[PDB]
């Protein structure tokens, strides 16, 4: 499992059978890409990055929420 | 107090058979098999025995897994010798040829 700090690489990865898993925690939110040998997590604190990334969900990738 | 169980069918305590106690998300204390430590890489010259810098100390296998960096250094003998030995080598070779030529001209 790898995690990503900078949204850019994350977006290069979800731009590269693709599905995206978003999960809510009290203080934080996480976005999760499945790829052959790695599970990519992306965490953010503030709601701005949050909504912005929710926007970022493309038609190619389907969004699952737990 | 939690007690453990070997997981390997080798109950005898051997340097290769060592175990470490790990605490799981389950709340269990589980034996996990710990690997063996290896000796650091030393310069190969006679009587030298210096610990080489900038090379990884890794169990022999993992040596196929690492990046070129850890396998090497940038000198003339990067992997095999330390700087001191390199240096003394250079110097010795140069000066020895000098004496060689000198003997040559003194012969002719």
């Amino acid at each position: 499992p790898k995690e990503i700090t900078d949204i850019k690489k994350f977006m290069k990865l979800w731009q590269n059978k693709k599905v995206v898993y978003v999960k809510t925690n009290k203080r934080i939110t996480k976005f999760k890409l499945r790829g052959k040998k790695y599970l990519y997590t992306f965490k953010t604190a503030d709601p701005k990055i949050a909504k912005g990334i929710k926007d970022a969900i493309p038609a190619t990738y389907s969004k699952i929420e737990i | 107090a939690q007690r453990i169980t070997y997981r390997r069918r080798c109950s005898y305590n051997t340097r290769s058979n060592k175990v470490r106690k790990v605490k799981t998300p389950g709340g269990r204390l589980v034996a996990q098999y710990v690997k063996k430590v290896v000796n650091y890489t030393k310069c190969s010259e006679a009587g030298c025995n210096v610990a080489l810098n900038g090379i990884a100390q890794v169990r022999p296998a993992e040596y196929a897994t690492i990046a070129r960096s850890a396998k090497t250094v940038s000198r003339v003998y990067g992997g095999e010798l330390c700087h001191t030995c390199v240096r003394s080598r250079i110097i010795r070779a140069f000066l020895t040829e000098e004496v060689k030529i000198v003997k040559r001209k003194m012969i002719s």
């Binding site: - | 940038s74 000198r75 003339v76 700087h83 390199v86 250079i90 140069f94 000098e98």
Partner: protein, 143 residues
């Protein structure tokens, strides 16, 4: 007693360039605000010319001769002061540019020297007392 002179061939001792031969362009007894220790500016053979047979062909003999020069600053302490000297092989005062070095022009000087050396090497004159040395400059040292 001091021999730092422009044109003295020295060997680099420890460094990625350790074991290579090069000539002193400039010598700063105590150095700049930049390098606060005693150092020398030097131009030398990084990769030496490969051996050339009398049986090879044109393209072979030409390609064989390629030289890759380097220009480095080296603390004098990392240097072995060879007694061989080549002053005239080129004007290093001319081709070694404090500017070009600091100015991100490194590759330019590289080219210039490659040109110069390659030219000189095949042009080596067998009667030159300058040449007995020249050979050694392009010589390969054995450790």
């Amino acid at each position: 007693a001091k021999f730092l002179k422009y044109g003295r061939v020295v060997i680099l001792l420890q460094g990625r360039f350790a074991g290579k031969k090069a000539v002193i362009v400039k010598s700063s007894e105590d150095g700049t605000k930049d390098r606060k220790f005693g150092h020398v500016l030097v131009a030398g053979v990084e990769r030496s010319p490969k051996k050339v047979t009398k049986r090879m062909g044109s393209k072979k003999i030409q390609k064989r001769t390629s030289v890759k020069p380097f220009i480095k600053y080296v603390n004098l302490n990392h240097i072995m002061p060879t007694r061989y000297s080549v002053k005239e092989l080129c004007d290093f005062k001319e081709l070694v540019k404090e500017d070009k070095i600091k100015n991100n022009a490194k590759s330019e000087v590289r080219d210039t020297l490659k040109k110069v050396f390659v030219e000189k090497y095949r042009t080596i004159n067998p009667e030159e007392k300058s040449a007995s040395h020249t050979k050694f400059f392009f010589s390969k040292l054995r450790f």
